[PDB]
């Protein structure tokens, strides 16, 4: 449940996390910029090339599609029914199928599939600390607004390190309360809402204790501030990082010409 | 009489054997104590008593109820009434407004009448030694040694029968530890089993009647502590500790004092020393 | 040679009615294991926080906290905190870094040590505590013993001159307690530090070079551990578990066997009982 | 303006919000995520102006650990950070009141769950705004009637904790 990294050897694993994260944001941006059918063919080709390059079995992608498949089909069907034009095919009182509606449903399912595939390739093919460092680096432009990014990086790091510990603490607290006789799912709305205080209040107080202890520790080891501190973990650009950008640029060129424009 | 038949829990690439073939029949009314090295699955076996977990393939006979791998979560509010678990840091489960309401939050879940629940909570705060005027203070406003006592009076007020305790006196002062152990040793006297899980071995030697030794998720020895601490070689081979009195007696036997009997407790060791010098 | 000196103190917390530490005066010789023992909530962690300048006395005019010949003041805490390192009670609360060998680099990061030096200092510090095989391992995959070992490595990376074990081994399996005490004593012998261990346990303090007893924020008695424990009445009245040897001697005295107060530790008792039986 | 203890507590509350996004309440007919509870804490304790940062970092950490399976996007971070801001504006330090919690949940549902989250979905998946609105109108119309009770009891619990000696200030 915690973490989704899957080790391997393919070259996508060697792409620097900042370059990969920028490529994913850029792919999400360039999804918007595709309307014509050949443009969606280009999106499909590039997404499937990236997926076949990451060298993963289809079951992890299916695991990434299963939670939100119902919303995918519901939205695709709503788009097909809402927009009508051309051949009418099967008809009803208001449910009017159409060739334009069918192709629009397909062209929204394509957007769903590509967004899911690219996001899953990000989450699966890079370590959580690597993504944390990538985001702490991407937050650099905020230095121009005089806001402090050292505080944000520290808060992200502490929260990321304490998510699993607090999850174990939470499940232990629920186990103790269930052993006392609590029922966390049955009894109506009022009972189901009253039975969340025992889940939270001991967790909140344990969080207060952990916060005080960790603040004392960091203050005792010499945390004067986030300015004037080197770093232990660093991200260094490689030659393989030229592979995304050259890819990431090429896609753009096609959408300059391939779409209706 | 608690009975376990081929009980075995498993955690996928991370399939871990958290527990293996267990074959034991705990009797009723005996201060059973669980021992084993760190990571020996004492807590996993402990959580099978109130069916918080469920055996992967086996059978549990607990307090007259039967637990099987397919048994659902419905109908357990009449088992967890007869089997109460006090986790390691029980003081980290207090949440209510006042100590009395926190203590009676236990019985209120098991169909106790409000007046009956309040009277039971008052009785069991009086028994655990909590102060009379400390009843209505906020549970978060007390010390550690008082939070622990409130928590212990919380998972024990509705008079369970197969109570299991994961180190109830981990961080108490020696007077408090002695008081809690006497409370439990007196609680079983009324006819309730007090299964205990302690890495400490002096109080197990002093109080416990049955000892369950767990090695790497499997029961290895189950007998009285008089017949478990007989040879130090086995205990040192299976990572188990030894009570201080037994270790001192073994060390003294090197000088050749030929101590009669088998001392386990400090008064017993002192009496054995006195009887030997004659 | 008094490495650490505390004169009259008042550390009234803020708000509470009674002071947390009344007039407290003690000294710590350099290189000597000095152990503080006190009742639960007698004001030991407050002394620990006072030593490394994290807190401060309220009456700054006639209160002195000298560390390594450097007085404690408003413009000196960031220097004294460099040469004193504290290991706190909770093994996992103080683990700040994302992973081992990244936590051990926190003390060096806070002092802007260049990375080429850090990459060797953290490796050596992890090697000292024997956690070499577990570098870059997540905190949730470690027990209490390993987390305390990595915290010791972390406070040793900055190369301190005082290690204050604020009840470091009060949450572990006795095997872990023995292992960590052996590790700390080995590090102290190798690097020539001064260790102050704060423990409610008495067996751990039975080997200390000096013992300081705190009662209600005051220094009750002070001395060597072979002349502090034998006055069992004080240790019983303040709520401290007497060591095994002295409890057994008290039991024998109750039964009718009188032994000298010089008889400390176990093998001395064994030998004395042997000669008594041989008669 | 935040002492180091309060920053570590903010990281704690962000972690709690990330965790509570997975614990669902309900049955097979209806399931409601508990993530909203995290928001109200970030609204109740630290206020709105730090509640925004708390929400944004909560969404970032949720994307890092549990995976942003819905596609990386900045609009989703904005919607996850625009909830705690409203919660803080309504109930940061003011005393407990039922009208405050009702208005808070209604305003967050109108502004975040609808009106902006639907706008981001419509922009990403290229569908018309009405289609996206009608696809998720049911849950965004049923959920506030449960949120206004769960948040009330959670706020009661927090108000009870804050009066103890655990909370320093
Ligand atoms: N849900 C689980 N079910 C079974 N085994 C588990 C589970 N989670 C972890 N384990 C592993 O099972 C082994 C035994 O777990 P556990 O029962 O916690 O040992 P334990 O010694 O009783 N814990 P402790 O109380 O600190 O001594 C360890 O290697 C755990 O990592
Ligand atoms: N933050 C605080 N605010 C008010 N009083 C406090 C605070 N911390 C400690 N005290 C009190 O000050 C006294 C000394 O505290 P402290 O030294 O932490 O006890 P302690 O011995 O460390 N507890 P323990 O760690 O189990 O030994 C006690 O009476 C505490 O209740
Ligand atoms: Mg245990």
Coordinates of C-alpha atoms in Angstrom, one line a residue, chain D:
Chain D
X1 CA 6.5 33.6 12.2
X2 CA 6.4 29.9 12.9
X3 CA 8.7 28.4 15.6
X4 CA 10.3 25.1 14.7
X5 CA 7.9 23.1 16.9
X6 CA 5.0 24.5 14.9
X7 CA 6.6 23.7 11.6
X8 CA 7.2 20.1 12.7
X9 CA 3.5 20.0 13.8
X10 CA 2.5 21.3 10.4
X11 CA 4.4 18.4 8.8
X12 CA 2.7 16.1 11.2
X13 CA -0.8 17.4 10.2
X14 CA 0.1 17.2 6.5
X15 CA 1.1 13.6 7.1
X16 CA -2.2 13.0 8.9
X17 CA -4.1 14.5 6.0
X18 CA -2.3 12.3 3.5
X19 CA -3.1 9.2 5.6
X20 CA -6.8 10.2 6.1
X21 CA -7.2 10.4 2.3
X22 CA -7.3 6.6 2.2
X23 CA -9.5 5.6 5.1
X24 CA -13.0 5.5 3.7
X25 CA -16.2 5.4 5.7
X26 CA -19.5 3.8 4.6
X27 CA -20.7 0.6 2.8
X28 CA -20.9 -0.8 -0.7
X29 CA -23.7 1.7 -1.5
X30 CA -21.8 4.8 -0.5
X31 CA -18.1 5.4 0.4
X32 CA -16.8 8.8 1.6
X33 CA -13.1 9.5 1.9
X34 CA -11.9 11.0 5.1
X35 CA -9.4 13.3 3.4
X36 CA -11.7 16.3 4.2
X37 CA -11.0 15.8 7.9
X38 CA -7.3 16.6 7.3
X39 CA -8.4 19.9 5.7
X40 CA -10.4 21.0 8.7
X41 CA -7.4 20.4 11.0
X42 CA -5.2 22.5 8.7
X43 CA -8.0 25.1 8.9
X44 CA -8.6 24.9 12.6
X45 CA -5.0 24.8 14.0
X46 CA -2.7 26.9 11.9
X47 CA -5.1 29.2 10.2
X48 CA -5.9 29.8 6.5
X49 CA -2.7 31.5 5.3
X50 CA -0.6 28.5 6.4
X51 CA -3.5 26.1 5.7
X52 CA -3.0 26.8 2.0
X53 CA 0.7 25.7 2.2
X54 CA -0.4 22.7 4.2
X55 CA -2.9 21.6 1.6
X56 CA -0.5 22.1 -1.3
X57 CA 2.2 20.1 0.4
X58 CA -0.4 17.5 1.4
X59 CA -1.3 17.0 -2.2
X60 CA 2.4 16.9 -3.2
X61 CA 3.2 14.3 -0.6
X62 CA 0.1 12.2 -1.6
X63 CA 1.3 12.3 -5.2
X64 CA 4.8 11.3 -4.1
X65 CA 3.9 8.3 -1.9
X66 CA 0.4 7.0 -2.8
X67 CA 0.7 8.1 -6.4
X68 CA -1.3 10.8 -8.2
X69 CA -3.1 8.3 -10.4
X70 CA -5.3 11.1 -11.8
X71 CA -2.5 12.6 -13.7
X72 CA 0.0 15.2 -12.5
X73 CA -1.4 18.7 -12.7
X74 CA -1.1 22.0 -10.9
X75 CA -4.9 22.6 -10.8
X76 CA -5.4 19.6 -8.5
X77 CA -2.8 21.0 -6.1
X78 CA -4.6 24.3 -6.2
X79 CA -7.9 22.6 -5.3
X80 CA -6.3 20.6 -2.6
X81 CA -4.8 23.8 -1.1
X82 CA -8.0 25.9 -1.5
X83 CA -10.0 23.9 1.0
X84 CA -8.0 24.4 4.2
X85 CA -7.9 28.2 3.3
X86 CA -11.7 28.4 3.5
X87 CA -11.8 26.2 6.6
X88 CA -9.3 28.4 8.3
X89 CA -11.2 31.6 7.2
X90 CA -14.3 30.2 8.8
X91 CA -13.2 28.5 12.0
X92 CA -9.5 29.3 12.6
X93 CA -9.7 30.8 16.1
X94 CA -13.4 31.7 16.4
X95 CA -15.4 29.7 19.0
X96 CA -17.3 26.6 18.0
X97 CA -20.6 27.3 16.2
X98 CA -22.8 25.1 14.1
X99 CA -23.5 27.8 11.5
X100 CA -19.8 28.2 11.0
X101 CA -19.2 24.5 10.1
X102 CA -22.3 24.3 7.9
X103 CA -21.3 27.4 6.0
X104 CA -17.7 26.2 5.8
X105 CA -18.6 22.8 4.2
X106 CA -21.1 24.4 1.8
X107 CA -18.6 27.0 0.7
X108 CA -15.8 24.4 0.2
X109 CA -18.2 22.1 -1.8
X110 CA -19.3 25.0 -4.0
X111 CA -15.8 26.4 -4.5
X112 CA -13.5 23.4 -4.4
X113 CA -15.4 20.1 -5.1
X114 CA -17.6 21.8 -7.6
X115 CA -16.8 24.9 -9.6
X116 CA -13.1 24.4 -9.7
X117 CA -12.3 20.7 -9.6
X118 CA -14.9 20.2 -12.3
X119 CA -13.3 23.0 -14.3
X120 CA -9.9 21.2 -14.1
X121 CA -11.5 17.9 -15.1
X122 CA -13.2 19.6 -18.0
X123 CA -10.0 21.3 -19.2
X124 CA -7.9 18.1 -18.9
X125 CA -10.2 15.6 -20.5
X126 CA -11.6 18.1 -23.1
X127 CA -15.3 17.4 -22.3
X128 CA -17.9 20.2 -21.9
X129 CA -18.3 21.7 -18.5
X130 CA -21.9 20.5 -18.2
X131 CA -20.8 16.9 -19.0
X132 CA -18.1 17.0 -16.2
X133 CA -20.6 18.6 -13.8
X134 CA -23.3 16.0 -14.4
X135 CA -20.8 13.1 -14.2
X136 CA -19.9 13.9 -10.5
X137 CA -22.9 15.9 -9.3
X138 CA -24.3 13.0 -7.3
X139 CA -21.4 12.6 -4.9
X140 CA -20.7 16.3 -4.6
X141 CA -24.4 16.7 -3.7
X142 CA -24.6 13.9 -1.2
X143 CA -21.2 14.3 0.6
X144 CA -21.8 17.7 2.4
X145 CA -24.7 16.2 4.4
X146 CA -22.1 13.8 5.9
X147 CA -19.2 16.2 6.1
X148 CA -21.1 18.7 8.2
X149 CA -21.5 16.0 10.9
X150 CA -18.0 14.4 10.6
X151 CA -16.3 17.8 10.7
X152 CA -18.5 18.9 13.7
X153 CA -17.4 15.9 15.8
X154 CA -13.8 16.2 14.6
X155 CA -13.8 19.9 15.6
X156 CA -15.3 19.0 19.0
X157 CA -12.4 16.5 19.5
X158 CA -9.8 19.1 18.5
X159 CA -11.3 21.7 20.8
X160 CA -11.1 19.2 23.6
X161 CA -7.5 18.4 22.9
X162 CA -6.4 22.1 22.6
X163 CA -7.6 22.8 26.2
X164 CA -5.2 20.3 27.7
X165 CA -1.6 20.7 28.8
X166 CA -0.4 18.8 25.7
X167 CA -0.8 21.9 23.5
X168 CA 1.8 24.4 24.6
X169 CA 0.3 27.7 23.6

